Design a protein around this ligand. Structure first.
Ligand SMILES: O=P(O)(O)OC[C@H]1O[C@@H](O[C@H]2[C@H](O)[C@@H](O)[C@H](O)O[C@@H]2CO)[C@H](O)[C@@H](O)[C@@H]1O
Ligand SMILES: O=P(O)(O)OC[C@H]1O[C@@H](O[C@H]2[C@H](O)[C@@H](O)[C@H](O)O[C@@H]2CO)[C@H](O)[C@@H](O)[C@@H]1O
Lengths: 474, 474
């Protein structure tokens, strides 16, 4: 017997400010690092950027009406820091807060629970110029001031808050792979910026307990659970290292306020461990979250990697299947194709059982409730005559993942909700507009901006029925 | 660059009372459950039992002299409860305490650290008769009385203490497989007795903090780290279940005082979860150990097991290689031979890297120091003319495991010591005398006690050199 989804289950969908809003220079908004980064040639797919995105800043009423038609119980969005503090610090921009006030009111007036995400990668460029943004401890108080501003203005109406969305992605991509701003390839700087982000996460959670005492808050982690390739002891050891280096390194800090020791010792041997100040451990250990946010898309299978072995591999940002290659850390592990699952056209593994596994691992290690803040299928969609988008492939992916959530709940995992990525089509930061995730098709591609009109996909009606039956009919 | 073994690393060897002592009915000793069980027809290999064993009770001076010749830093032995309390909970048998006093004095006069193990499976039969031994809460205070008796008598001379040795074995074999006393095959009773054993462990650790404030104490867990067979999601999920049900089920309670939730829910769903009394969780959570004791011999590889699938399999107690078959829990997991490691003639996997993995897992999950309380190769030995025993196979096994301990220490695992099983040959409870583990061969077999003479094997001199070089020459 499978348990039902709890009556309070938050059936959601999600977006991110830079990928959805547009209005990049309106109403006093400052430049974010992504405004500046995406305009540099070669940084994004076909030069696509968020100047207009899908224009949700001007069309939020239409989009929320579509959410209400679908019956969404929750909508997770991120607030653009540079709309609220165009400088990062300094004077608050009332016009920026007013947009999110109007958005939250539109959501509440349609019975949709807002889930406010504080940070999705868009620190104001002014803070990068002033002091290197996440590489300086000055960002802890500046981020805290920004968060407290939002807590005071919206805490009366927003129960659920996410602090840093995918810190492991914006840190690793920004400082190890050089694919996100600041475009750095320096592991020492990566772990320093990462430690400061950990302190910022902890500081704002502490502030949240003061300003929103009955709210619920947590970071959201981009979780690819690791698998060993097989039972060869060296491959299981590679899995132990991969899970600790890629996943425990973040979630142990979020849950326990401690870095895992083997990873710490390895980094220390390379001279890469972060600088620790007196009080750091105390602050990190005291900032217990109400839930672990989880962005899940795929598992990763790993195998042994000799000391002279694989480092950085090829990443698929074109949609040409089979173009990704193995990446790893010499001496510890490297990725390998999992022969037992299929992949998307961007070589992302399709592994719904892996979501049950990841939920089980988090509950087993940390005993935390989980809010699934992102999950979805990025794929090409075709607009057929009659405003028909037959995205059965997206329905299939979503169905199987939701089925596995129900099994994890039956296993005893406390899952608060499920936010599909994404509500409407939106900009993929590095993959352009053709890698679509929405329930709602948006009419543009990478060449032609067209009119951005909204068209309900077949998956829209499928998820409408999911919510209508509280997940009993998948 | 491997880090050295720490200077005071406890190079040890180990035994257990019923398996080594003999003198089963001397000097006032009462019956243990193993005295009675092993004399039931069909319960042990060739009807072997511990009436005489290798007669360490009378020959302990000779054996300790051999330990001193080897240069052992530590000797781990177990105290026979039925020598100290012949009826389990009445008046103390001073002759019983006096034997362990003489033993401890002999060890300390030769510079060997005693490591006292309170319980290696030999609860007095009188407590089984009176109330069913571990199945009754009465055993908590009776075990506590016995433990405090030893703490008061020996706490001045014994720093390192082990509480329950392989609770997961004596409980699961006693109550699920029916292969140990009391011969029960009932999962509900198994988890009830297990819960009471957990409370007994917690109670005596609490007592230890009062009576031996400067000592170190921990339980010892029979740890077979689980591997998934491959990266098929269903097999990784089976590994998640196997690791939780077989390993976290015990070690989470020892380290955190809490059972893992997914396993608890499954047992609850079958009406198998233990009865919990007011105060149980507070006691279990309060009894933090100084170390996790680890008895390691092999890893276990698992795969998906359907609801109609494999239950109990064939267990090899004969030394005829290849006679074991898969065991598991229908719906959760089943074992499968690991094609990437060799096995002994008793079908135990030889996986030294698995020891590094297991040590890494305990440090990663619990941040506890580890005392390796047992590790060894059980194999046939041949006595060659001139009293020579060339057990290069045992040297190879021990060398490779000690090498992996050093890698684990380099990774940052705090390993306090390493006790090889066993110092002399001794009785295997279910496999007789031919499944030998000793550094010291004992001249007897399953048919005759012969003269019980002690003969140093080649591995004796190998380990002597290991100790002399503090593990720098393996
Ligand atoms: O738009 P994408 O690249 O297809 O990503 C989908 C959403 O997932 C998050 O980012 C990805 C990241 O880009 C990957 O490189 C990494 O491997 O995993 C995370 C998935 O957690 C972002 O939350 C979002 O902006 C993406 O749209
Ligand atoms: O004498 P054995 O059966 O060869 O075992 C040697 C030592 O290992 C522990 O028992 C085994 C147990 O008998 C196995 O059936 C089980 O699978 O695992 C443990 C291994 O930890 C005994 O507790 C140990 O003290 C034996 O003397």
């Amino acid at each position: 017997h499978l348990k039902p989804f709890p009556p309070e289950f938050l059936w959601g969908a999600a977006s991110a400010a830079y990928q959805v809003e547009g209005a990049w220079n309106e109403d006093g908004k400052g430049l974010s690092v992504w405004d500046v980064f995406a305009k540099q040639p070669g940084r994004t797919f076909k030069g696509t950027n968020g100047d207009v995105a899908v224009d949700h800043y001007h069309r939020y009423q239409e989009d929320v009406a579509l959410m209400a038609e679908m019956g969404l119980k929750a909508y997770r969005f991120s607030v653009s820091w540079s709309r609220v503090f165009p400088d990062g610090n300094g004077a608050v921009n009332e016009k920026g807060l007013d947009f999110y006030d109007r958005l939250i009111e539109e959501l509440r007036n349609h019975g949709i629970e807002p889930i406010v995400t504080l940070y999705h990668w868009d620190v104001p460029q002014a803070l990068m110029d002033a002091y290197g943004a996440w590489e300086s401890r000055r960002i802890i108080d500046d981020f805290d001031r920004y968060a407290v501003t939002l807590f005071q203005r919206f805490g009366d109406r927003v129960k659920y808050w996410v602090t840093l969305n995918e810190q492991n992605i914006f840190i690793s991509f920004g400082y190890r792979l050089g694919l996100h701003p600041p475009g750095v390839k320096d592991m020492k700087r990566m772990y320093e910026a990462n430690h400061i982000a950990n302190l910022a996460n902890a500081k704002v959670i502490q502030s949240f307990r003061h300003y929103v005492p009955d709210g619920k808050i947590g970071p959201s982690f981009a979780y690819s659970p690791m698998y060993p390739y097989d039972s060869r002891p060296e491959n299981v050891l590679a899995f132990e290292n991969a899970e600790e280096f890629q996943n425990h390194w973040w979630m142990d800090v979020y849950a326990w306020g401690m870095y895992p020791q083997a990873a710490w010792n390895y980094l220390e041997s390379q001279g890469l461990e972060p600088t620790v100040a007196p009080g750091d451990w105390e602050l990190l250990q005291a900032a217990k979250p109400d839930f672990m946010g989880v962005n899940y898309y795929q598992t990763t299978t790993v195998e042994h990697n000799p000391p002279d072995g694989v480092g950085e591999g090829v990443m698929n940002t074109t949609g040409k299947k089979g173009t990704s290659t193995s990446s790893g850390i010499p001496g510890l592990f490297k990725t390998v194709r999992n022969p037992h699952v299929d992949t998307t056209n961007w070589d992302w593994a399709i592994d719904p059982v892996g979501l049950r596994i990841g939920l089980r691992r988090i509950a087993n290690r940390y005993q935390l409730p989980i809010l699934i803040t992102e999950n979805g299928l990025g794929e090409f969609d075709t607009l057929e005559p009659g405003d028909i988008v037959n995205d059965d492939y997206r329905i299939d992916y979503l169905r199987r993942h939701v089925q596995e959530i129900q099994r994890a709940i039956t296993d005893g995992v406390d899952v608060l909700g499920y936010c599909a990525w994404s509500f409407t089509d939106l900009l993929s930061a590095l993959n352009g507009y053709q890698k679509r995730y929405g329930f709602v098709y948006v009419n543009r591609d990478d060449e032609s901006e067209k009119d951005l009109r909204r068209i309900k996909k077949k998956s829209f009606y499928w998820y409408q029925r999911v919510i209508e039956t509280n997940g009993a009919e998948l």
